[PDB]
Design a protein around this ligand. Structure first.
Ligand SMILES: Nc1nc2c(ncn2[C@@H]2O[C@H](COP(=O)(O)OP(=O)(O)O)[C@@H](O)[C@H]2O)c(=O)[nH]1
Ligand SMILES: [Ca+2]
Length: 307
């Protein structure tokens, strides 16, 4: 019996908001850590574990869009960050690139996690184009730093949110759509680790697919009725919000969950959907869970790496 310890760490303003909304959504068996320079923001965090970094540098304020201040602040609080991460088997670091704290502190937090032996996954946003060229440039440097510090990285360009709203969609509703990428990826790992499958995958398979890999896709899809396996698989790999699409994936962990009606044929259909869209020679780690409380619903979970 091995039950992996998962932690989700929000770094800076956008990252701490994401953690707050994940908490309100309710995600258990996961520990949440909030890291920030901005003490006023941190005081409103719902995370059980809060770390104010850089108080000597910023006097309790944010980094004023200076990534060097976010970096120095994280380095000066390294022991505090190590203590909060201690014991983790997997760490998700979420933050918005382009500002001062996230850009500079998130790669330091990720590096510490990886140096402590945790499987480290980053989920970061790129700023909207209307925030200007300098923000995008600073964000690009943060993304490169993240990629050098994580096992695997998921980038969400905020400009993609403009593809899924109408002219009236509330901004907070758009942000919740971006929140789902991290949240459902974490939930998929948790479900995979907690349930013994008929073809069982566990945390070691997660480690094999994600360790020292670079760009990643994490997706989930649910469908019912006719064509349910194909429709759920297409949903799992086709997010409009991703910088890294399924195309070019060389390693895929794929789990299918269904009721007693789960057919061998439709398991093949779903696997073929993922492999055709990859358009590559894919190493599938394939798994299957029979949940008898499910009736006509099928759930496909995909982790794709090796780009
Ligand atoms: N999708 C999303 N993006 C955010 C959110 N908050 C901030 N951002 C983006 O993240 C970038 C950095 O913001 P922020 O985290 O507040 O800066 P920092 O606290 O100084 O590191 C901004 O330029 C926005 O593009 C959020 O809640 N959701
Ligand atoms: Ca399992």
């Amino acid at each position: 019996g091995h039950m992996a310890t998962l932690k989700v760490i929000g770094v800076g303003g956008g990252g701490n908001n994401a953690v707050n909304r994940m908490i309100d959504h309710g995600m258990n068996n996961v520990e949440f850590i909030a890291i920030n320079t901005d003490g006023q923001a941190l005081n409103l965090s719902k995370a059980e574990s809060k770390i104010q970094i850089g108080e000597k540098l910023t006097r309790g304020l944010g980094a004023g869009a200076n990534p060097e201040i976010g970096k120095k602040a994280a380095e000066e609080s390294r022991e505090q960050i190590e203590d909060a991460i201690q014991g983790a088997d997997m760490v998700f670091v979420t933050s918005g690139m382009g500002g001062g704290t996230g850009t500079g502190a998130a790669p330091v937090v990720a590096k510490i996690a990886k140096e402590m032996g945790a499987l480290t996954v980053g989920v970061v946003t790129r700023p909207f184009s209307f925030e200007g060229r300098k923000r995008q440039t600073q964000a690009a440097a943060g993304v490169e730093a993240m990629k050098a510090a994580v096992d695997t990285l998921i980038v969400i360009p905020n400009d993609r949110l403009l593809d899924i709203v109408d002219k009236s969609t509330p901004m907070m509703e758009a942000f919740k759509e971006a929140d789902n990428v991290l949240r459902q990826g974490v939930q998929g790992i948790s479900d995979l680790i907690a349930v013994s499958g008929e073809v069982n995958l566990d945390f070691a398979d997660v480690k094999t697919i994600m360790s020292n890999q670079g760009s990643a896709l994490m997706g989930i899809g649910v469908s019912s009725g006719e064509n349910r396996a194909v429709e759920a698989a297409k949903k799992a790999i086709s997010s409009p919000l991703l910088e890294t699409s399924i195309v070019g994936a060389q390693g895929v962990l794929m789990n299918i969950t269904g009721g007693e009606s789960l057919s061998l044929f439709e398991a093949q259909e779903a696997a073929d959907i993922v492999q055709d869209a990859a358009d590559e020679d894919v190493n599938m780690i394939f798994g299957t869970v029979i949940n008898p409380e499910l009736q006509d619903e099928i759930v496909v979970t995909v982790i794709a790496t090796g780009f």
